[PDB]
Coordinates of C-alpha atoms and ligand atoms in Angstrom, one line a residue:
X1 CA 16.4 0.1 -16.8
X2 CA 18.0 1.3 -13.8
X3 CA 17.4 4.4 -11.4
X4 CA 19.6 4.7 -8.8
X5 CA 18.6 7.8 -7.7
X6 CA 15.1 6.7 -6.4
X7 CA 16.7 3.5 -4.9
X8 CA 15.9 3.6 -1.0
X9 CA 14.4 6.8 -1.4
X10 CA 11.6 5.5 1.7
X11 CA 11.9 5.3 5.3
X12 CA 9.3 5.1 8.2
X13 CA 8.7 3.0 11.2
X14 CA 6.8 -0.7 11.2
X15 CA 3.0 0.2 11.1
X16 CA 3.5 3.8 10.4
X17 CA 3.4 3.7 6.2
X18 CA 6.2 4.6 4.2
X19 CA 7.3 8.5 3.9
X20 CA 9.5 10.1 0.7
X21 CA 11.4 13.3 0.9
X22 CA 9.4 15.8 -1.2
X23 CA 9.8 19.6 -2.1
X24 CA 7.2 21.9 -1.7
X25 CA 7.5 25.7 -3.3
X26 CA 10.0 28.6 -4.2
X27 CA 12.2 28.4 -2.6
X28 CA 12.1 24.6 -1.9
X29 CA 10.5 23.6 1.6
X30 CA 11.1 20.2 2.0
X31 CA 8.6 18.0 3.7
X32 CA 8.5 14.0 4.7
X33 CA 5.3 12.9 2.7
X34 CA 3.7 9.3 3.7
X35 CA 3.5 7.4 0.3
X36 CA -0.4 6.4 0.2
X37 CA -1.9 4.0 -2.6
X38 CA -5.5 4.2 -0.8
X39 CA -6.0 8.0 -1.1
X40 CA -5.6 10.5 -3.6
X41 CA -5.0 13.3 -2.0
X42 CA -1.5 15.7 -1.4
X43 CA -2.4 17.1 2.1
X44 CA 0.3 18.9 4.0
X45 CA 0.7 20.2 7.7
X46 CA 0.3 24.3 7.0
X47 CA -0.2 24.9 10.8
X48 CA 2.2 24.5 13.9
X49 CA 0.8 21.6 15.4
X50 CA 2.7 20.0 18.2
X51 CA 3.2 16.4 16.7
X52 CA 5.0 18.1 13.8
X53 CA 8.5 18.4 13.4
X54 CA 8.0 20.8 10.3
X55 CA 4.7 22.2 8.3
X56 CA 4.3 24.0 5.0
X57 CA 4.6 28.1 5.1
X58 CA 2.8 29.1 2.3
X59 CA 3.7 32.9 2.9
X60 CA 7.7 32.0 2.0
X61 CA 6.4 30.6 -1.7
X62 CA 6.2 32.8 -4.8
X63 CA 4.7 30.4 -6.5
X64 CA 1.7 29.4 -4.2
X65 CA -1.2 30.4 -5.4
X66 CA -5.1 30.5 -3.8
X67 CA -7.5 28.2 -4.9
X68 CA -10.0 29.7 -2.5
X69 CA -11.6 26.4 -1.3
X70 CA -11.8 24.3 1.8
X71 CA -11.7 20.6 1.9
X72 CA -12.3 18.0 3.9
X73 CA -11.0 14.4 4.8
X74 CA -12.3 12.2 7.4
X75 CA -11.0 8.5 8.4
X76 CA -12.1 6.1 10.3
X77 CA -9.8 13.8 10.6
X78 CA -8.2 16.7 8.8
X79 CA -9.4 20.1 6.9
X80 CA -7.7 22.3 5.1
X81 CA -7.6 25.2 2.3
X82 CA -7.0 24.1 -1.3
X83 CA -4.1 25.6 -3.7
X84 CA -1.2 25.4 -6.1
X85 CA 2.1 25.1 -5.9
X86 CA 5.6 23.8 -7.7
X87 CA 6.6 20.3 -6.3
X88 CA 9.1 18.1 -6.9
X89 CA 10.8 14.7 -5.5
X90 CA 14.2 15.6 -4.9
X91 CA 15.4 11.3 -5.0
X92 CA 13.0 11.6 -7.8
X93 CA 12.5 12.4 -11.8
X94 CA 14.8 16.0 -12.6
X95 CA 11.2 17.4 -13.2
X96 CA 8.9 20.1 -11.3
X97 CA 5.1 19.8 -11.6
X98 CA 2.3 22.2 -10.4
X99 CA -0.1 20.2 -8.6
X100 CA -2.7 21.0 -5.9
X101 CA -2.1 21.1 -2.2
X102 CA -4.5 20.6 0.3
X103 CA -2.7 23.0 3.8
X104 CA -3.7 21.3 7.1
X105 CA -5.0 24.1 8.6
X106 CA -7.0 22.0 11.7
X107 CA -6.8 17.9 12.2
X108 CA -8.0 15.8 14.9
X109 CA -6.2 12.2 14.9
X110 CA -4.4 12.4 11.7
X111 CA -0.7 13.4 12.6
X112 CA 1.5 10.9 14.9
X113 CA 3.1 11.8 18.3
X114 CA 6.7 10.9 17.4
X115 CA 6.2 10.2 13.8
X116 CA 8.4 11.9 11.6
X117 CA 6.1 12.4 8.4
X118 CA 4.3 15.8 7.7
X119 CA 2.1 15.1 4.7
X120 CA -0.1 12.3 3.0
X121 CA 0.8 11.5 -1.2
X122 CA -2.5 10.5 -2.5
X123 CA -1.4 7.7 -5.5
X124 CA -5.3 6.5 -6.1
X125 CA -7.0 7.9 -8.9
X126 CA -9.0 11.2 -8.9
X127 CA -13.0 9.6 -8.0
X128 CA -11.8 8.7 -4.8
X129 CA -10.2 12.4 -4.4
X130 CA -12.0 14.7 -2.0
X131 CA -13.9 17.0 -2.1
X132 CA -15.2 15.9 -5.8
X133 CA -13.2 14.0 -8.6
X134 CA -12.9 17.3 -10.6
X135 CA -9.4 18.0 -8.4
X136 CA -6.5 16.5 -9.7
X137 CA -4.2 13.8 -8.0
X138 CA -0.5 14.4 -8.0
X139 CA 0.6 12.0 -9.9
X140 CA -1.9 12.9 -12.8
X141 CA -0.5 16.3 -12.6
X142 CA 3.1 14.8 -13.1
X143 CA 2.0 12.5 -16.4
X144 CA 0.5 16.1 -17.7
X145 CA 3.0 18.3 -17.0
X146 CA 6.5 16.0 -17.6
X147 CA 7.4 13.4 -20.0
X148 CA 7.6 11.1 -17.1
X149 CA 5.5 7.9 -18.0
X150 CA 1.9 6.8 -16.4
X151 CA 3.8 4.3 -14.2
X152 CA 5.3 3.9 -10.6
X153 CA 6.8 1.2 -8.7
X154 CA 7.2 0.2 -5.0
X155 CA 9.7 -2.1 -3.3
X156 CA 8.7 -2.0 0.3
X157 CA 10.9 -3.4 2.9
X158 CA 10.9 -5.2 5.9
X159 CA 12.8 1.7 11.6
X160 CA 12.1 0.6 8.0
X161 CA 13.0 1.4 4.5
X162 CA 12.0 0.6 0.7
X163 CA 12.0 2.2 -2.9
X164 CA 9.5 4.1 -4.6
X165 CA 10.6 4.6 -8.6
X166 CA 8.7 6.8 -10.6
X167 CA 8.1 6.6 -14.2
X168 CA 9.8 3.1 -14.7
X169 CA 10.8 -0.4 -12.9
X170 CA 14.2 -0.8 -11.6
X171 CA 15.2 -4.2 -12.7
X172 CA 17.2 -4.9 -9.3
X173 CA 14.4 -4.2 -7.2
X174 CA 13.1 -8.2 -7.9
X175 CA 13.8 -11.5 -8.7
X176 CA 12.4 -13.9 -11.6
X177 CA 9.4 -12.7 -13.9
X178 CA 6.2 -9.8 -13.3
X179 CA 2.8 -10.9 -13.4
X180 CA 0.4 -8.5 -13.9
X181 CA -3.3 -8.6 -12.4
X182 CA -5.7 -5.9 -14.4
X183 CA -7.1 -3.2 -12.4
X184 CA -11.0 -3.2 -12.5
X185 CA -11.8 0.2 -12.6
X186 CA -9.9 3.8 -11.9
X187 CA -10.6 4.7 -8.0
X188 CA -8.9 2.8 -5.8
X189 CA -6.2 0.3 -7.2
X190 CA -8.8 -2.5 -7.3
X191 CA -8.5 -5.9 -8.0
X192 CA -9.7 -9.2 -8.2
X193 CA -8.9 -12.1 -5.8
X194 CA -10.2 -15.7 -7.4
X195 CA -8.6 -18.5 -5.1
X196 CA -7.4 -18.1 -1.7
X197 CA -5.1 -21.4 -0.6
X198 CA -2.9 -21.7 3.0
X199 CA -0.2 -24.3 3.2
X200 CA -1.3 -25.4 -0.5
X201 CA -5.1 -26.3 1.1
X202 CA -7.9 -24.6 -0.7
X203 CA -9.9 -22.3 1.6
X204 CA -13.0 -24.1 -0.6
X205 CA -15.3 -20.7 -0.4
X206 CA -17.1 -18.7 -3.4
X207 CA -14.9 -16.4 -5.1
X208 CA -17.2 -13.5 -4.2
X209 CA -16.3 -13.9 -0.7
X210 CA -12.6 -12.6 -1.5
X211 CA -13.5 -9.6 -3.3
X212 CA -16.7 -8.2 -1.4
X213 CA -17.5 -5.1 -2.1
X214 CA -14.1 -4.3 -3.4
X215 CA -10.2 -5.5 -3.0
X216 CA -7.4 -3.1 -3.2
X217 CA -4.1 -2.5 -3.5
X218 CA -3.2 -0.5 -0.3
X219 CA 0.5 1.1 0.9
X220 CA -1.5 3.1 3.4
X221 CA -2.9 -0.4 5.3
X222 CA 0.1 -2.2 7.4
X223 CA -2.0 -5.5 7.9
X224 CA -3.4 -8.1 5.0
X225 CA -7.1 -7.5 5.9
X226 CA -9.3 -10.1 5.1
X227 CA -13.3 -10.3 5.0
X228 CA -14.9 -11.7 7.6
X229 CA -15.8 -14.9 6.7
X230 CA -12.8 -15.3 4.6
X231 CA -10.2 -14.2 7.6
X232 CA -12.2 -16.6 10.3
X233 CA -11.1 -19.9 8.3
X234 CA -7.7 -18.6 7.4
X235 CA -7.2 -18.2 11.2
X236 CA -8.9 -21.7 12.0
X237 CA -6.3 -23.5 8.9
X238 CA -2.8 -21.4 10.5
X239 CA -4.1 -22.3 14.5
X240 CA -4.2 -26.0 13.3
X241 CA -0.8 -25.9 11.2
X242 CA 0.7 -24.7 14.1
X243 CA -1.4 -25.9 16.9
X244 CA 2.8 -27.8 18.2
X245 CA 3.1 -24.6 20.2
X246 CA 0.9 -22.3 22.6
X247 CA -0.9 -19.6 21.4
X248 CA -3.0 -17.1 23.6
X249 CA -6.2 -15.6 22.3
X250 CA -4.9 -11.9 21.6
X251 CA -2.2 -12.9 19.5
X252 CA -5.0 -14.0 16.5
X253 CA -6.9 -10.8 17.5
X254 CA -3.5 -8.9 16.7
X255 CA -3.3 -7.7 20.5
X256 CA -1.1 -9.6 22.3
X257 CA 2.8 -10.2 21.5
X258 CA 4.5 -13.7 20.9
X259 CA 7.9 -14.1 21.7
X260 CA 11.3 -16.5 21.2
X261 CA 14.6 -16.6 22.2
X262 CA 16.6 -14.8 19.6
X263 CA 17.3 -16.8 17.0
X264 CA 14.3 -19.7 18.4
X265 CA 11.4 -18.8 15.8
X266 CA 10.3 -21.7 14.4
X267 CA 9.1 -20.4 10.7
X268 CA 8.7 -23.8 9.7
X269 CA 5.7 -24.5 11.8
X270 CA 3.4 -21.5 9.6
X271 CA 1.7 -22.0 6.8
X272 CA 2.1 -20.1 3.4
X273 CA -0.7 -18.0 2.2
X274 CA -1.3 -17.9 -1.4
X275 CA -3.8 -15.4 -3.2
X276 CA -4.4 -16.1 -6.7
X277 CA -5.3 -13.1 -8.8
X278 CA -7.1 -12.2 -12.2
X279 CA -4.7 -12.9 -15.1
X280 CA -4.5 -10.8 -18.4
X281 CA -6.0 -13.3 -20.8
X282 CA -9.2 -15.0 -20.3
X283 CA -9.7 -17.6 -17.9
X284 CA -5.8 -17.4 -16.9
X285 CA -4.3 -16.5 -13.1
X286 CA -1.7 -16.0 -11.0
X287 CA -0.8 -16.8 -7.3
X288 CA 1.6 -14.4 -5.2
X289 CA 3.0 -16.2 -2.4
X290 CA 3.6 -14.6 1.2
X291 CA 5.8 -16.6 4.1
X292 CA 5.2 -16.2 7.7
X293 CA 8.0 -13.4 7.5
X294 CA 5.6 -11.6 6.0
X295 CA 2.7 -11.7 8.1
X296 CA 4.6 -12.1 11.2
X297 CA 5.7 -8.4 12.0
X298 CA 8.4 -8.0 14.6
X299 CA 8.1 -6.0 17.3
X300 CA 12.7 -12.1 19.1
X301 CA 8.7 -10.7 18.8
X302 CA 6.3 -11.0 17.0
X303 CA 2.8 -9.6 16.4
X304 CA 0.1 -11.5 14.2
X305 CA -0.1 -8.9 10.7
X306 CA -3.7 -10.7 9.8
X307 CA -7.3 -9.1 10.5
X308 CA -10.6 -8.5 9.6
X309 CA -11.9 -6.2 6.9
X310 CA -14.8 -3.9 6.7
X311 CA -14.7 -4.3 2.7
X312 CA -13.2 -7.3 0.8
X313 CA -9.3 -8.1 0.6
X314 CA -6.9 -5.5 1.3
X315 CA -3.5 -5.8 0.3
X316 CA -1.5 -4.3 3.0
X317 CA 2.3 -3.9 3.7
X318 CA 1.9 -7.3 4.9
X319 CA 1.4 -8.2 0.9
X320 CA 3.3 -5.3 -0.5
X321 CA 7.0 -6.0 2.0
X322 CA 7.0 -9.9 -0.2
X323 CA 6.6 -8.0 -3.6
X324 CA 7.9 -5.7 -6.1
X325 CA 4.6 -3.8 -7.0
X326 CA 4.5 -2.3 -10.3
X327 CA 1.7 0.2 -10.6
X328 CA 1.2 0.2 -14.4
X329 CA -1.5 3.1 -14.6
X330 CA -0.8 3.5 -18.7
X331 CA -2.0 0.1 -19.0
X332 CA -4.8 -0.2 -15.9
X333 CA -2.7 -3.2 -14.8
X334 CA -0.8 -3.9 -11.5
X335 CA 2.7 -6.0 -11.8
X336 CA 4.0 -8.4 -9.2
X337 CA 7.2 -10.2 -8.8
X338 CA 9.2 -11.1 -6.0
X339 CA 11.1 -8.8 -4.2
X340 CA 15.1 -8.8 -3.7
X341 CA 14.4 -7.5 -0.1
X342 CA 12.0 -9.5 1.4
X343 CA 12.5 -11.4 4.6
X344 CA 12.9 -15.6 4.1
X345 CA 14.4 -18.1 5.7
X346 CA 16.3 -20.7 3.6
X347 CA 14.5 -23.6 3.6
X348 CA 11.1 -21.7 1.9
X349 CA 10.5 -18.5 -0.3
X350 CA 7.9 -16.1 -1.2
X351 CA 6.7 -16.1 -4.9
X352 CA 5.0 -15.4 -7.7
X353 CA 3.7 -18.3 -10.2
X354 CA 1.7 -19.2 -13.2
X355 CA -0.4 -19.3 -15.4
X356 CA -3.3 -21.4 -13.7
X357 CA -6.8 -22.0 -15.3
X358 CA -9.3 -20.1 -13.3
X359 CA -12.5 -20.2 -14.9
X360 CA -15.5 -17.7 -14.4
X361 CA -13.1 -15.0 -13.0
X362 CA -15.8 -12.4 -13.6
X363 CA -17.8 -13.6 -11.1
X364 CA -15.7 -13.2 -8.1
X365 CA -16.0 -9.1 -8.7
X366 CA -19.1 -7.6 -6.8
X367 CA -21.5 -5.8 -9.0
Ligands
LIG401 C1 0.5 6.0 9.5 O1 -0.8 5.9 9.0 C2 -1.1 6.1 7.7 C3 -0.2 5.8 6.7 C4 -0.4 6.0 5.3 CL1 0.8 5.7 4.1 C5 -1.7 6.5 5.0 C6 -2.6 6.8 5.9 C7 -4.0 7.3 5.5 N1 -4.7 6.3 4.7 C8 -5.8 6.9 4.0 C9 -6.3 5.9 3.0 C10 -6.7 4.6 3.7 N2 -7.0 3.6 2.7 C11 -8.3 3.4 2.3 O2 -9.2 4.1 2.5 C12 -8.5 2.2 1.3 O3 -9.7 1.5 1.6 C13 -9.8 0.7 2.8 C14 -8.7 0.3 3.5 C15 -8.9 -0.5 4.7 C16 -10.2 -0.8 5.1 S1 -10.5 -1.6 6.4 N3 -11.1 -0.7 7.5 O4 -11.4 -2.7 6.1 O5 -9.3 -2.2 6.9 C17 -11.3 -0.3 4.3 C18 -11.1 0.4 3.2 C19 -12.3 0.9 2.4 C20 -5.5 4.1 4.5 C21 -5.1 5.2 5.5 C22 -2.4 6.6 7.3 O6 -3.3 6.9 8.2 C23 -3.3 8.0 9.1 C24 -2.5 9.2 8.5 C25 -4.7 8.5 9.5

């Protein structure tokens, strides 16, 4: 139905992921924890490092207790010592969970200057966990442990705020009716992308170009990152859709800034961007909508939220701040719907549509 008390409950900068207020050991230490769909891992700061503003003090917890193993995370650093501990979300289910906790003993490039997050929530499923799938997520722990049900849901939000609910879908939190993409398999949130169109134009390439090696669902990632290919003819389709004004070559890149006088953006010039996903029944899809609200992130300026992947489609912020995700883990599907806080102007809106016919959907997945 309705929970109000996880309403808002997420705060961060723009292009610095989304943090939650969480509670770490007896008595409570609380800690701002970045809300992470592309890891699986609850790493905290343990150690007095500069950047942070608080860390985890495991000698002031009854309840911690030694797991007597090291671990460690690299990204394209941080390694710490493995144990247990009571947590709990305080703008969160009434519950308390033991689940494992990864200290941040030594890190090299992981915490922010200025940032005001101290920990990384892990929300991917437990192969992707380090150092071996055989250590248990967070929120597996939770499901376990509680009576809280294999489901969360994230409203993310154009300093910057959103909602994460746990256990349910607030029915405020979007607009019109949730369609729901099935996830492939339990690591990463993957899915399948079938038909990519801009302005209503088919991008006319083989499905398999979408998904290459692997498209996810990603909180952790602020841009929509496209595969190679794929992201140099959306470019070419949005540079001729709105070839009326100038455009340097850094802003494409995602280096350089483009600027109006407040109140001067023309939105109408930008194309849409739809992605059609994998339906639930055979042969049927969906297309989620984003505006150029959503893939133009402010910095009135601007900054060009589109780049290149290293993998196949990754569904950043950019994605994520048009929707009303529903992470539906109890039945390996992810919802979409429009969300009540995303940025439009009045003339278009983002969306979420269907059913189309989409046929040899199968295909499109790499094997
Ligand atoms: C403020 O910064 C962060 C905010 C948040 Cl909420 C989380 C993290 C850590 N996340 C760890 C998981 C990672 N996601 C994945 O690995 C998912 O898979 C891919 C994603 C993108 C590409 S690629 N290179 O093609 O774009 C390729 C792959 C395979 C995102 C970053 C943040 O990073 C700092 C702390 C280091």
């Amino acid at each position: 139905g309705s929970f109000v008390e996880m309403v808002d409950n997420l705060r961060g900068k723009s292009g610095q992921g989304y943090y939650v207020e969480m509670t770490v050991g007896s008595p409570p230490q609380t800690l701002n924890i970045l809300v992470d769909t592309g890891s699986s891992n609850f790493a905290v700061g343990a150690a007095p490092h500069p950047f942070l503003h608080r860390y985890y003090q495991r000698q002031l917890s009854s309840t911690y207790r030694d797991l007597r193993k090291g671990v460690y995370v690299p990204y394209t650093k941080w390694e710490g010592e493995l144990g247990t501990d009571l947590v709990s979300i305080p703008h969160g289910p009434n519950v308390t969970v033991r689940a494992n906790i990864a200290a941040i003993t030594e890190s090299d490039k992981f915490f922010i200057n200025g940032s005001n997050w101290e920990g990384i929530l892990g929300l991917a499923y437990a192969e992707i966990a380090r150092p071996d799938d055989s250590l248990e997520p967070f929120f597996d722990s939770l499901v376990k442990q509680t009576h809280v049900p294999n489901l969360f849901s994230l409203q993310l939000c154009g300093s910057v705020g959103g909602s994460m609910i746990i256990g349910g879908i607030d029915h405020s939190l979007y607009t019109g009716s949730l369609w729901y993409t099935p996830i492939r398999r339990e690591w990463y949130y993957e899915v399948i992308i079938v038909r990519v169109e801009i302005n209503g134009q088919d991008l006319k390439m083989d499905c398999k170009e979408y998904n290459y090696d692997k498209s996810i669902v990603d909180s952790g990632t602020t841009n929509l990152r496209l595969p190679k290919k794929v992201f140099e003819a959306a470019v070419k389709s949005i540079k001729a859709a709105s070839s009326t004004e100038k455009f340097p070559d850094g802003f494409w890149l995602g280096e350089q800034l483009v600027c109006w006088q407040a109140g001067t953006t023309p939105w109408n010039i930008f194309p849409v961007i739809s992605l059609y996903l994998m339906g639930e029944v055979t042969n049927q899809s969906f297309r989620i909508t984003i505006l150029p609200q959503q893939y133009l992130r402010p910095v009135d300026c601007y900054k060009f939220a589109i780049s290149q992947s290293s993998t196949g489609t990754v569904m950043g912020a950019v994605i994520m701040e048009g929707f009303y995700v529903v992470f539906d883990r109890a039945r390996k599907r992810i919802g979409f719907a429009v969300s009540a806080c995303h940025v439009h102007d009045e003339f278009r809106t983002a969306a979420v549509e269907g059913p189309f016919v989409t046929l040899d959907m199968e295909d499109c997945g790499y094997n």
